[PDB]
């Protein structure tokens, strides 16, 4: 019925303050649509290390995506996508932070670059994992295929590679005519 969704958004040194801003606006437009609804949200920034910008019980208190994300700062470091997903599996999906044990686990990962680390995300095996690779780094099939090990199977449906950050607007409208 109800779902717990975590936004795992990139904050590396390859993002431009405008491109970082577009991701932030994207996450909001999504929340805004999925409001008056049995969803609750959390947002984690990742780079070299990882930070919960707001958790679930922050969301259910505040509700406003604008007010929830106003303290966000651009990390401007690396892209440790492996350590990031593990961090979301063990640190964020806890009832300590307001997560519901009956709610299904969803993870929206947003990145503009390949992982700067290694390992596995076996800790996040019961989490539904979407991954969004954004332009000019995933401008080759080989690099786009690196995101498949992060997503849920099949990649055909759980991986989206966008050409430009301006195309995050396009993606949002897609989801509006979707069920």
């Amino acid at each position, epitope marked *: 019925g109800n779902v717990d969704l975590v936004f795992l958004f990139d904050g590396s040194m390859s993002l431009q*303050p*405008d491109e*970082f*801003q577009k991701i*932030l*606006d994207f996450m*909001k437009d999504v929340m805004k649509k999925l409001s008056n609804t049995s969803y609750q949200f959390a947002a984690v920034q990742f780079s070299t290390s990882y930070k919960t910008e707001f958790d679930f019980s922050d969301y259910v208190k*505040r509700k*406003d995506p*604008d*007010a929830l994300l*106003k*303290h*966000v*700062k*651009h990390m*401007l470091l690396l892209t440790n996508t492996f350590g990031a997903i593990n961090y979301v599996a063990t640190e964020v999906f806890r009832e300590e932070l307001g997560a519901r044990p009956d709610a299904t686990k969803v993870l929206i990962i947003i990145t503009d670059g390949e992982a700067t680390d290694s390992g596995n995300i076996d800790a996040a095996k019961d989490i539904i994992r979407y991954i969004i690779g954004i332009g000019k780094h995933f401008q080759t099939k080989e690099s786009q295929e690196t995101l498949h090990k992060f997503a849920s199977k099949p990649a055909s449906e759980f991986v989206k590679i966008l050409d430009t950050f301006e195309k995050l607007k396009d993606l949002f409208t897609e989801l509006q005519k979707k069920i």
Partner: antibody, heavy 121, light 108 residues
Framework: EVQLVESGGGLVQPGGSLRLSCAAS????????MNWVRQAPGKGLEWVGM????????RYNQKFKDRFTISVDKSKNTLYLQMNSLRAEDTAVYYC??????????????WGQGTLVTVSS | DIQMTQSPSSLSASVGDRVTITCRAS??????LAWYQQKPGKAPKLLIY???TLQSGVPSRFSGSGSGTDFTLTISSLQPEDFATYYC?????????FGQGTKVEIKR
């Protein structure tokens, strides 16, 4: 385009009040911190304080916190600065400037055109 | 608070010269310094932030440098359009403090 148009400046007597306005356009007004900066004639820039329109959270320069009050109206996409118990040194050009919060504390990328406030009897 | 000290207070240089404006900090502010260009009657305009990052739209003839207390704006190859007081600002802690400005005038 990002537009910041200010109004409300003019002549005001010592001990008098005045509310400035900053009309914001061309971007999501509730997505950026807003700032007030002032400049006395032929002098430098002074930070007054900031406000986040979403929930109207504020941070002031303590130099200004007593007599200056920053508020917002999300419905009008408008930022206010309420000045009280004014005096001669408050004569300045008052700018509203959109801030970036990403790096360090805050810097300003978009500024208003400014408005002169003259405190005189 | 952090006192931002600019050097010099005013200057004059001919078109095509290297202008070096220095901003110094009361105490360490990492790399988080910003430069503004203010033209007559107009509002200040962002040139540099985080010590050395050029804003989008600003000509690459503008360059920021420095970390800690000593910072430098270098306008290389000065232009007639480049007449306009320059202010520096610290964005490392609150309150936000500006320099005092340096008038850059043009020898012809």
């Amino acid at each position: 385009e990002v537009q910041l148009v200010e109004s409300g400046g003019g002549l005001v007597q010592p001990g008098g009040s005045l509310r400035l306005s900053c009309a914001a356009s061309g971007y999501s007004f509730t997505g950026h911190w807003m700032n007030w900066v002032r400049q006395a004639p032929g002098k430098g820039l002074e930070w007054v304080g900031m406000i986040h329109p979403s929930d109207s959270e504020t941070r002031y320069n303590q130099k200004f916190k007593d007599r200056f009050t920053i508020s917002v109206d999300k419905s009008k996409n408008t930022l206010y600065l309420q000045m009280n118990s004014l005096r001669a040194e408050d004569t300045a050009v008052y700018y509203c400037a959109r801030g970036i919060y990403f790096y360090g504390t805050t810097y300003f990328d978009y500024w208003g055109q400014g408005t002169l406030v003259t405190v005189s009897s | 608070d952090i006192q931002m000290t600019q050097s010099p207070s005013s200057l004059s240089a001919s078109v095509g010269d290297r202008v070096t404006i220095t901003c110094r900090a009361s105490k360490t502010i990492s790399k988080y310094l910003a430069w503004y260009q203010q033209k007559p009657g107009k509002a200040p305009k962002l040139l540099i932030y985080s010590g050395s990052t050029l804003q989008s739209g600003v000509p690459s003839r503008f360059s920021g440098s420095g970390s800690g207390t000593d910072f430098t704006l270098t306008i290389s190859s000065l232009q007639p359009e480049d007449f306009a007081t320059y202010y520096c600002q610290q964005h490392n802690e609150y309150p936000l403090t500006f320099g005092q400005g340096t008038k850059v005038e043009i020898k012809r």
